[PDB]
Amino acid sequence: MNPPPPETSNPNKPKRQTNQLQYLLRVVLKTLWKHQFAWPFQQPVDAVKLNLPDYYKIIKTPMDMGTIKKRLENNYYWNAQECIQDFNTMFTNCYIYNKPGDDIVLMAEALEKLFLQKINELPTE
Numbered sequence: 001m002n003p004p005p006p007e008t009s010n011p012n013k014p015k016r017q018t019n020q021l022q023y024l025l026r027v028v029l030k031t032l033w034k035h036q037f038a039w040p041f042q043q044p045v046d047a048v049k050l051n052l053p054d055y056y057k058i059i060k061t062p063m064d065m066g067t068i069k070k071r072l073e074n075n076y077y078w079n080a081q082e083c084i085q086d087f088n089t090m091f092t093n094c095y096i097y098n099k100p101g102d103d104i105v106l107m108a109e110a111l112e113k114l115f116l117q118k119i120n121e122l123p124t125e
């Protein structure tokens with residue numbers, strides 16, 4: 001069964017737009033989105049659809065790139081590090097829920113490498 005998805009707006013949280021956050025949307029996210037292994041990560045895990053009734057019994061800080069995309073579009077983040085932490089949560093959830101060698105984990109590892117490659121150098125202020 002499904003909990004509510006992570007919030008993509010929060011009127012009590014301050015917003016910010018920075019060159020690094022613009023980069024994270026326009027280049028990092030939008031490039032990862034097009035990768036052949038991106039599709040498991042483009043939306044929150046639907047435990048009912050996927051017949052994974054235990055997913056949210058294990059994963060208590062769920063995150064996906066669709067949520068991150070909407071957060072970036074809504075200037076939800078204060079800085080790039082906050083956004084990068086959401087990516088890191090998404091990858092780590094996949095490693096927690098699954099086990100090494102699983103097909104989904106191979107997909108997450110490949111995307112994580114590409115993600116790190118792209119955030120190695122960010123624009124300046």
Ligand SMILES: CC(=O)c1c(C)[nH]c(-c2nc3cc(N4CCN(C)CC4)ccc3[nH]2)c1C
Pocket residue numbers: 039040041043045050052055093094097098104
């Ligand atoms: C448990 C785990 O780590 C995991 C993650 C992070 N994701 C998925 C997953 N995500 C999916 C997305 C689809 N879709 C098919 C339809 N298409 C248009 C887009 C949506 C189908 C099956 C999926 N399985 C699993 C099993």
